[PDB]
From a paper:
Inteins catalyze their removal from a host protein through protein splicing. The HINT domain catalyzes the protein splicing reaction, whereas HEN domains often function independently of the HINT domain. In this study, we elucidated crystal structures of HEN-associated archaeal inteins inserted at the same insertion site (VMA-b), which is located within the A subunit P-loop of the vascular-type ATP synthase (VMA) from Thermococcus litoralis (Tli) and Pyrococcus horikoshii (Pho). The two three-dimensional structures highlighted a modular architecture consisting of HINT, HEN, and an accessory domain (ACD).
Among VMA inteins inserted at the VMA-b insertion site, we could obtain crystals of the VMA intein from Thermococcus litoralis (Tli). The TliVMA intein comprises 429 residues and is larger than the PhoVMA intein (376 residues) but similar to the size of PI-SceI (454 residues). To prevent self-cleavages during protein production, we expressed both inteins in E. coli with alanine substitutions of the catalytic cysteines 1 (Cys1). We solved the structure of TliVMA intein at the 1.6 Å-resolution. The crystal structures of the TliVMA intein revealed a very similar overall structure as found in the PhoVMA intein, including the three-domain architecture known from the three other reported HEN-containing inteins. The HINT domain of the TliVMA intein also contains the β-strand extension found among thermophilic inteins. However, TliVMA intein probably carries a catalytically active HEN domain capable of binding to DNA and introducing DNA double-strand breaks. Indeed, we observed that TliVMA intein cleaved its reconstituted homing site accompanied by a strong DNA binding affinity as indicated by an electrophoretic mobility shift (EMSA) of the substrate- and product-DNA fragments. Our results demonstrated that the ACD in TliVMA intein induced a second cleavage site in addition to the theoretical homing site. The ACD of TliVMA intein strongly resembles the helix-turn-helix motif common for many DNA binding proteins, such as transcriptional regulator proteins.
Author numbering: -2 to 429
The structure:
């Protein structure tokens, strides 16, 4: 076949949020002239959609002008240390990187040639965001019994964080469960501010609850895609949150973590365990809007499968305003850097590097340099811009396993001006 990805590959879009590329195809098929050539077809979209791509060291919105479907006789599945699992055609390209005296160069590598130990470009920061106006019917929308927020701001985002992490929706009641009565009071304050109605705090057998009795309010959250309970296995992050400014995402994430995130001392990581796999993948994209690289793992808990998102390591935690040493954390943000050639090209700044705690010899025999060490090194060798832009956005993630899968299937791709777009179960740079 051609260059393309498995239909379950997520893609971040402005118009539809984070969606499987096969779902995107089903939405867009027919909405433009299609050219068919045997096992390949291309649609030129009547209305281009917006995805995200990498350009000039940043990750910003870019137009996708075409969508492709092909039929492939086999696939390659790539797993990485962070928990990305990408399934693509053998000639589909990923990117490896090298930092030299001249900056960061991304190199295209076909999936058929990827091997364990390679490090592929993934996204740890997604730029952009605007305050999203909540979409209305052009019909006969608008409850008049409550006040309906019209912009997704930090207050609503905080409330959504409590509701998704620790809430239930019954047909006529919104509930938030927590043993901190001050958090329940805060949620009630927000409900008055946002919706003009409030609830009451009920002391229950093993937990307190804030109960807000309003069918219009339930309907508002259901239209947003809020799960009916913690255990919903199919809930998704709302598109409007993925398009929001980082301040809004931060309000949501902080609220989620206070409700159902847990800090593990020995490992140096905040863990979120959710029952929704696509909800977990969506959390990873939200975290990239904060500049955080999540890890992902499937876990067994009392005979059922759960999805663990970890915010791990001192650098990630700083992005939440948390200042903590994590000496038990294994570094996974490793920069491929040609240390010796850079050092010589810059005239061997031995004393200056020693002053930053770097002994150049410790990197001359293939040793890994962390991003944190590279930030310091870079300032002394003329590479600050690469450290503070390109490598603020791109992490080079270790491939742990590659497998050829000899099963034919339909595959999909999109066309962008950058020849790349952001997709995968956690944000990954995909070539087109």
């Amino acid at each position: 076949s051609g260059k393309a990805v498995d239909g379950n590959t997520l893609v971040l879009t402005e118009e539809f949020g984070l969606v499987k590329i096969k779902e995107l195809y089903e939405k867009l098929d027919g909405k433009g002239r299609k050219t068919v050539e045997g096992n390949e077809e291309w649609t030129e979209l009547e209305t281009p959609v917006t995805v995200y791509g990498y350009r000039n060291g940043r990750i910003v919105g870019i137009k996708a002008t075409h969508i492709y479907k092909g039929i492939s006789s086999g696939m390659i599945e790539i797993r990485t240390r962070t928990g990305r699992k990408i399934k693509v055609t053998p000639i589909h390209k990923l990117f490896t990187g090298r930092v030299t005296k001249d900056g960061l160069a991304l190199e295209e590598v076909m999936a058929m040639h990827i091997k364990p130990g390679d490090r592929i470009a993934v996204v740890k920061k997604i730029d952009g965001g605007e305050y999203v106006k909540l979409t209305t019917s052009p019909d006969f929308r608008k409850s008049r019994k409550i006040k309906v927020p019209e912009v997704l701001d930090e207050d609503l985002a905080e409330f959504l964080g409590y509701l998704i992490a620790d809430g239930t929706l019954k047909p006529r009641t919104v509930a938030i469960y927590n043993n901190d009565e001050s958090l329940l009071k805060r949620a009630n304050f927000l409900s008055t501010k946002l919706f003009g109605i409030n609830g009451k705090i009920v002391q229950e057998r093993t937990v307190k609850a804030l109960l807000i009795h309003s069918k219009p309010l339930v309907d508002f959250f259901r239209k947003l895609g809020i799960p009916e309970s913690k255990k919903a296995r199919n809930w998704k992050v709302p598109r409007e949150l993925l398009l929001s400014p980082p301040s809004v995402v931060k309000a949501f994430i902080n609220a989620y973590i206070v409700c159902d995130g847990y800090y593990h001392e020995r490992k140096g990581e905040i863990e979120i365990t959710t029952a929704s796999e696509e909800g977990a993948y969506g959390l990873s994209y939200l975290l990239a809007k904060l500049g955080i690289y999540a890890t992902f793992r499937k876990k067994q808990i009392k005979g059922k499968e759960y999805y663990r998102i970890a915010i791990s390591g001192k650098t990630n935690l700083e992005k939440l305003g948390i200042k903590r040493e994590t000496r038990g954390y294994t570094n996974i943000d490793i920069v491929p850097v040609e240390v010796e050639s850079i050092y010589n090209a810059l005239g061997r700044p031995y004393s200056e590097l020693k002053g930053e705690g770097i002994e150049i010899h410790n990197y001359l025999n293939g040793e890994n340099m962390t991003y944190e060490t590279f930030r310091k090194f870079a300032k002394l060798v003329g590479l600050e811009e690469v450290a503070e832009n390109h490598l603020k956005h791109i992490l080079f993630d270790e491939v742990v396993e590659v497998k050829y899968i000899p099963e034919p299937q339909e595959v999909y791709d999109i066309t962008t001006e950058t020849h790349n777009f952001v997709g995968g179960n956690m944000p990954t740079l995909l070539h087109n």
